[PDB]
Every structure is written in structure tokens, then in C-alpha cells.
């Protein structure tokens, strides 16, 4: 039943020590063990620890070429199988040394709970993945939902480290474990419900986050091989107390077909058209809800246009509040264009002689007249508050650059019912997971939609309060929150990281290297997960929470294998987690066989 | 009675040396020891120290595979139990080595006092926590009240390290140990009183810092377990000479129900309604006491609005000094609004044709008029003061963005008596502890309240003087005093750190990592305390006061275990402190269970 004995040839310190592996037992690199030592007065002191180094030496072989004789039986040789243990816990916390010869044994039952501080987690423990020998690793939800700890940060080489798919596994674990229930017993209103929970996620890389609403045909065939190979009792999900089933209550939203002058509205998706709902903003919303700054996120040097943008934002806001009509466009009455080079065919003209702006192009043209033509090119003084003409043209030119890409999204030609039906609500009643398909959008349109949608949820939580947890799963954090660049979308993320704990917005974010992301986003994550990391980044300052033992291991980490670090447990523990039950590509949705 | 003997196999130097543990004795890692050696001429020299390394070896084992046989007795081997002693003090200051074979014994009586420099502390020593075996740790109050020492800085993993709970323990020890008396009698005029010691603390994270008035139902069940396990003589509080009771005279202040257009005033309290008093500021107080800059504390790039803020601050200051009325609002006579988009409703129009500003939004609207509409936009040059319109709308817009969150706190509609009663006074007569509930406020409203309150106490001490000690207990020191940002709330924290010693304001600050806080705040902390530190941060330059021997140990410190480092004693000492006698959550007050 024991696994080894504490070695005496090496120093035995309370923090770290070596032990010799017993015959007939194997010790893997990441095994969790427990050793119990006796004090002089006879009181026990238990040491819970994790293996970080493992080796084998040949005892007494002398010259190396003796092996041929040695293994033939001619020369006597003993094999020395040794393991180093990094102590994570001392239950009576006497920092005394164990005695050499104390029995080392695998932490398997309550001993494992003590080894992973599961007593500190209490009911808030939920499946975080599988350990070496099929024992689920317990994550403390109180360090994920804001109660005691913030959000999560996942890192690793894209394509190899499985961060996005792991984040979806964490979502499945959180929704399917009842951990939101158990930890909603904490109080009646501080945080409450497992039904209340919601998740918002964006489909940046094209068509990969759709088919969460269809089961993965391939899961059992790939997962059978793992259960066959590692000799597990069952499929991993059942080991977790998790079901091997896809996401439920899923809302799929996509931009409207990039329709050029077409009133017909259909989503852009080629590979999936069923169950996909188009989402659009309206010109009047755009001005009423102050969406203008979220067009501006350059992730480069640029200038300080904050004055210009702030002024026109307020001008549009008061304009939209002045609108009395039910339409989705913005009616402006002060647009006269003798020779502002726009054509007169298509402008819908109001009953009161006003011009009704129906497309994003018109909204930008009207911004051009007020800023650069209102009075023979010097512009409307009330719109350009003495701002430089160059500064104006930059602003205008960046709006022009993205309007070809953003125009289908922001529509003033729609009628009021179409606008209320197509309006993007990541918090719609009865929906648990909302996927926003921004894959066909441009690098600018993408962060526009991400910007206002995150802001809309956050504004909603400020206004309403914090008894519903909303999960935002965001890949490529560096572009959204760059280390030195300053931007409005970054600002909303700064708001979710720093204030979202007590507001109820949890970020499960991922990036290839945390060193390219804003320090304040990475710093505010209680849970840090590491996939296969780059050999150069492992020694960076952002990954010191990995002991040196772990970087070399972290360079060859296999897909499906992650190192999670959570505040309760002072060491990274390695975990594997099942394949997605949810389809992650089109052919995994095969209703009828292959 | 002895514990070991100085070893002769390792070097014996006066600063560091090893000794062999006697059989039947246990030597923990942080134990305090004394060894006495004899000079050639017969004079004794005492060495007091602290263990920093401890190990066990197998002496006389050739191969590690022999280990199993060794335990049976088949082969011969002896266990070597050795400890390294980091010398902290020599009674006679002679830097001569102790001879191998000198006797090592636990510092237990007067010897313990000599190891912890308690003779330097004199009457100013007070309990700072419990040592390895039940003896209280002396803390030098003179290094906390400003006489020879200053303030306190606590570092550690939030949620695991118990820094907030420890800080309240320090208040409890300071108030209930009569140390304020003992060290007040050196000269009564110089520094006077245990009744004159007060505390101000802020309740940000949850409803966690209310119910400090109420006893903790759960602490006997939790503290019984520790006394049972560690074989201590009594409950830890009795060991310290401290009582297990809550704070004596407490005042709980809360924001006013976020009342929308409601004259009724009630605290925002949802779980604790009894004993909570609402606090409010008045528009007139806002202008008279110069509360304007403290709205602006973004702690980022921001802008140079200091000129704008300084101008409008002085303008509102002279405006308030000109006010003759008894009302709480500000009456301005130069506000005309022919098309300012303002409303025709009750402005409590004055008898003299002036407008009486009663809400924060009105004050911002009047500011918008003077700065952006006065002379059809260019404004009153006694207000805009040649400042650009972009900067002007920026100052305006940031006031607008924050107005919704700060409006319920700043009321000019209140009557003079409601104002004098609801005014927040951390120094109220007959109060020892003041708790400010800002958990319901936004990130901006919180920074505001903390700013003007800390400034109010600081101004009062400048004006009055220093025979009352006021303790400010502040968690999350990284957001309030960032390392690189610059804000007014950081400036009052800087004034407290650099001047608070001789003014009587002592800061008990806590943050996850000292490396994220302003250097000047952390540098002026005479007492540094460390709970479980991040593996990454222990090697940072801000934690060099931890010797390398401690780092690995500090990575795994258990909740309730802290390393205090004080100027008198040259090394960090590990301590344990009781569970809170005061309730720290709702169900702790009245659980009636077990
Ligand atoms: N548990 C797993 N084991 C192995 N491969 C997995 C596992 N889960 C997902 N994958 C696959 O490995 C890749 C996962 O990477 P993904 O998370 O999509 O990208 P990244 O993590 O770089 O954002 C995809 O090929 C995915 O289908
Ligand atoms: N004396 C104590 N010993 C052990 N745990 C304690 C003690 N006092 C409080 N705790 C618990 O430890 C945690 C302390 O976290 P807290 O102090 O609130 O946050 P932080 O330490 O980051 O400021 C909470 O679970 C608290 O109930
Ligand atoms: Mg991805």
C-alpha cells in the first residue's frame, strides 16, 4: 500500500525531500503523495507534497561497460528509483524534518483532499480536470465567481496549447457541476442561482465556435483511445461527475450578409444557416448609446483624438435625444450641401424638410460637413471645438476606413420592429451561452462589436446589480488589452478585471503570452492556467509562478494537458481534461454516419 | 532541559552556525534558541538566534537502495538531526565563535526576551501574535505610533493570506493591551491616552466589515480545534493577555439608499439595518471644503486638468463663502438658460432671483453653462480662464460620467439639521472605531469618499495637533496608491505616510504585492508583515527583507500564519494569531449552531 521510504542520502527538509521508490510501484512526475512522521513526543505530523523530479541510478556498477555482465546476472547491481517531493502542505504545520525511512504513500482519499486544500474549498470545489490517476482536480469557485477570487487567465502556444477549448470545458464544468448552486447557498442575495448564470463568447477565428449546439460525433472515438490507453475506469466526464453532452440554451448571432443596398436581412454564415439569428445596431442607438468611441481602437501610436471623439459623441447624443420620430435613423435638419459632393437621389427626406440618415456612410458624411465644410471648409465651430483640421481628417479618415467594413452592422434603414428583433442581447432571458460571430468582420469591426457588447453588459451590471454571474470568454487578450497601448475596449476590460468581481462579470481570458497583455488584466486573475508554453517565455517575469521544475516540463506539454494554479494550492498541478462534447467544426456534426 | 550541541562538522561562525538535535527533542524551523559559550578567560558570551535550516540525514549509508534494509536493523546507520542557527543577538557584543559541543536550548524566559530585543521595547512591547510554543511576540508600539516607528504594511495572497483579518487583530491588541497607556506616560503632555486612540476603516469588498460590534459565534469551535491540536494551555487570547471580545465603541456609516428624487434618507444596508447611520455630503460643503479634485482619481494617463480643476475649485470656494443662506445648496445668480436644454421645474428659485443648486447634476449643469455656454460658448473668462474647449468638455464629461454614482451622496436638497446629523465624522466624540460602507458605491464614488474622508482627518490633525492617534486600515493599497499613477487620493496617502508619524495618523496598509504600490508609501512602513506570498513576488526587490531561507516556507504558509518583521528584531519571526472574536459575516452573529 505504501509507495516508498524517505531517503537519508539526501537532505530531508520540511519544504522539500527525497524518497526511494518501493519495488512494484511506479511514481510519475506529477504524483501527489503523503508521508506521516512521528515526533519525539509521539504526536504525528503529516506532510503533503507533489513530485517535481524523478530519476533512476545504478547502485554499485562501478565501470559503465559492466552493464552487459551486470544485467546478465554476473555482477550484483541494485536499481535506485528516487523521487523528489515539493511539500505543499504540513497539516500540523510544524516545519520539522521527516525521518528517513518514513513511509511515503499516494494521497488517495481524504489525504488527497488535504493535499489539494479541498477543505478550504468546501462546497465550492468543482471539477477542474483529471489528475494523474483519474482523481478530479478540485477548483475553488469562490476564486472564480468574485466571492474570494477574481477571473481566470489561460496561456499557451496557439494551436498547440488548448486554451479556448479548455475555457469551454471550464464553462461546461461550472454549469454542469451544480457548483453555482452549492456556492449560491453562501447568501440569499450576495450571489445567487445556477440558472442565473450566463456566458458571452465571440467567434474570432472563422466558424469554430458555432456547432456548440450539436454534439461532437468524434468525441467517443478519440476519448475511447485515451480510456483504453491510461486504463481508466470510465470515460473522463463520468470520472468528473460531468455529462459528456454539448452546450444547451445557445444563441447564435451573426452580421447581416454584408448586404449592399439590400433591405433583405440574412446572416453571413455559409456553413451554418439554421438557428443563426442576425444582429444589427441602428444609427439612432449608435448616437443615443454613445457607441462612437468604440470605433476608435487603433492598437498603435495614433494621436490623442479623445477630445474630438468625446465632443462628437456628445453632439450625436443630444441630437439623438432630440429625435422625436420612431425611425431607426437620425434626422438632422442642418445639412445643406450645395457642393459637398454627395448625390441627392437616395436621402430619405423628412416631412419637416430634414434629412434622415439611414446608412453609416451618410452618418460619416454628415460628420464631414459639420467638421470640414459647414462654413466654406472651416467647418461648423460648434462641432469642431477649435480642433486642428488635421486632427479632424484623421478622425474622419479612420471612420471612412472602417465604414466599408462596419456599414452592414449599423443600419438606419431598418424599421423599428426589425431593429428590436435583431438587437444583440447577450443577456436574453432563457439563453445560457451567446456566441457572437465576428469572424467575417474586419480587424476593426471585430473590436467595435466586442467593445460595445462588453460595455453594454457592464453598464447593465452597474445599473442592475450583482446576483447573476456573466462569463466572458475572450481569446487573444493581447489585441484587446495590449501592455502599453491605451484604448476604450481595453478600458472596458480594465473595468471587468478591476471591478467585475463585485459586479458579477467574470473574464475567462486567453493569450499566447501574458507578457504581451496589460499587467492589470493578467494581475487580477485568481486562476492561472498554462498550456504548452514557448521555451523563451517560460523564464519571463510573467511566469515565475511556475517553479523551475515546471518550465522544462511546460515546453513539451501535450495538447489536452494544462497546469492550473489556484490560490488555495501553492503549486501548479498538472491536469488533463476530456475532448469537447460540443462540436468545434462542421464535420463533427454528422447526424447520419461517416 | 537542553536541546542540542554545537556541531563541529560544519563551520562555527559568530553570525551563523549548526548544532545537532539531542535525541527526544524536536527542532522546528522558526524556533528561537540560545547557546552560551565560555571565553578562554572564563567570561561567558551568549548567542541568541533563530533556526533557518533544519534537516535529517542517514549517516553511514552507502547506497540509497540499502535504505529498506537499514530500517530493519540489518545494516548500521544513525539518523542525524541538524539545525542551522541564524544569530540575531550576542549579549556581550564579542564576535567570537561558540565552541563545538556547547549546549543549545530553547529561549524560553528572560532568554526569549533577549532574543526578541524586548529590553529595547520596555513598556512599549505589546502582543503581536503567538510564537511556536505559546509565548506572545512583543511588538514595539513606538515603531507604530510615530515616536520611533511609523505605520504598517501587510503583504500576501488575498483570500489565502489573512492580512485584513490580521490588521483588525492588531487594532484589537493595540486597544485592549493598555500599550497606549504604558507608552503615553513617558510624558502626558507629549502624547496622551488610551481613550484617545481611534480607528477609521473602509468596508469595500462586501458586507464583511459590518458586525464588528457583535461577537463571533463560531470562533470557539474553530479556536478549540487549534488549541486541541497544538496542545496549548488555554485559548490563544488568554495567552496574549488580550480578551476575546469585539470592538467597544463602533459607528457604522452607509450611503443613502441611492434615493432617486426621494427626500427620505435610509442607509443602503440590505443585511444589516440596525445601528447603521446614513452619511451624506452637502453641495455647500462640497464647495467650501474643496471636494472637487477628489472626483478625479483615474490613476492613469488622464490629462493636465489640474489647471481646470484648480480653477473651478477656487471658483466654487469663493461662491460658497459668498453664500449667506442657511441652506445646504449653492445659490448662483448668474445662471440664465435660454436654450441650455435645462428643465423648467422647481429649482427652488431663490427670493432674490437666484437659482439654488440642490442636486449634483444641477451643479454640473451650471458648471457646463459657465464653461461651455456662457457667452454663446466661449464662457465666462472668470471661469474658462483661456482653457481649450476640448479640455473643458473633458473635465465636464468626466463629471457627467461619474454624476449618476456620486449624486445620492452629495445632496443640496437636504435641510440643515439632517445635514449636520448625517455628516461623516471619523473623529466623533465617544467613538473608537468608524466603519465606512462604500461597497455599494462605484469605483469612482469609493475613491471619492475615501479621498475626502482621509483629507478631512489629515486637515483636522494639521490644524489641531497630535495627542490622539488615528489608525487608518486600508486594504487593496495598489488601487489607492499605484506605483506609477498620480491622483489626489494617492497624494493624501503620501501625506499620511511621510508626515503622519508626527501628526498622529498611522496607516495599517495591505496589498497583494508591495511591488505594485507606490515606493514612498511602502518605504515608510516600519512594521512589515507577510502572509502566504506568491512564488513570483518573494524574489522581487520589495521583499528582500525576507531571507532566502524563508521564501520556500512563505510560499506555503497556512491561513492564520504571518511573518512579522520589525526594526528591533533583525529577522522575520513567524507567528499565529487567534480567529476573530468579532463577527466577520452575517451568519457569524447569530448562528446558534454547532
Ligand atoms: N482535450 C484535448 N486534447 C487534445 N486536443 C484537444 C483537446 N481539446 C481540444 N483539442 C483540439 O486541439 C486544439 C485546441 O486548440 P484551441 O483551444 O482550439 O486553440 P488555442 O488553445 O490555441 O486557442 C484543436 O485542434 C482542438 O480540436
Ligand atoms: N485567525 C485566522 N486564522 C485563519 N484564518 C483566518 C483567521 N482570521 C480570518 N481567517 C480567514 O482567512 C481568510 C482571510 O481573508 P481576508 O483577510 O478576508 O482577505 P485578505 O487576507 O486577502 O485580506 C478568510 O477566510 C477569513 O475568514
Ligand atoms: Mg483559439
Numbering used by the authors:
A (entry chain H), B (entry chain G): 13 to 606
Sentences from the paper on this structure:
The nuclease NurA and the ATPase/translocase HerA play a vital role in repair of double-strand breaks (DSB) during the homologous recombination in archaea. HerA is a circular ATP-dependent bipolar translocase and helicase; it belongs to the HerA/FtsK bacterial translocases family, an offshoot of the RecA family. Each drHerA protomer comprises three domains: the N-terminal HerA-ATP synthase barrel domain (HAS-barrel domain) that forms the putative exit for the substrate, the RecA-like ATPase domain, and the helix-bundle domain which is inserted into the RecA-like ATPase domain and forms the putative entrance for the substrate.
The drHerA-ADP complex was crystallized in space group P212121, and the structure was solved at 3.4 Å resolution by the molecular replacement method using drHerA apo structure as the search model. The refined drHerA-ADP complex model contains two hexamers (twelve protomers) in the asymmetric unit; each protomer is bound to one ADP molecule. Although ADP•AlF3 was used as an ATP analog for crystallization, the density of aluminum fluoride, which represents the γ-phosphate position in the transition state, is missing in the density map. Therefore, this ligand-binding structure was considered as a drHerA-ADP complex. The binding of ADP resulted in each RecA-like domain to move closer to the neighboring RecA-like domain, generating a more tightened hexamer but still a more-or-less flat ring. The overall structure of drHerA-ADP has a height of 100 Å and its outside diameter is approximately 105 Å. Interestingly, the hexamer displays a certain asymmetry, with ~26–28.5 Å inside diameter of the putative DNA translocation motifs, ~23–25.5 Å inside diameter of the putative DNA entrance, and ~27.5–29 Å inside diameter of the putative DNA exit. Such asymmetry is probably due to the differences of ADP-binding states or simply because of crystal packing. In this motif, the conserved lysine (K175) forms ion pairs with the β-phosphate and the threonine residue (T176) coordinates a Mg2+ ion.
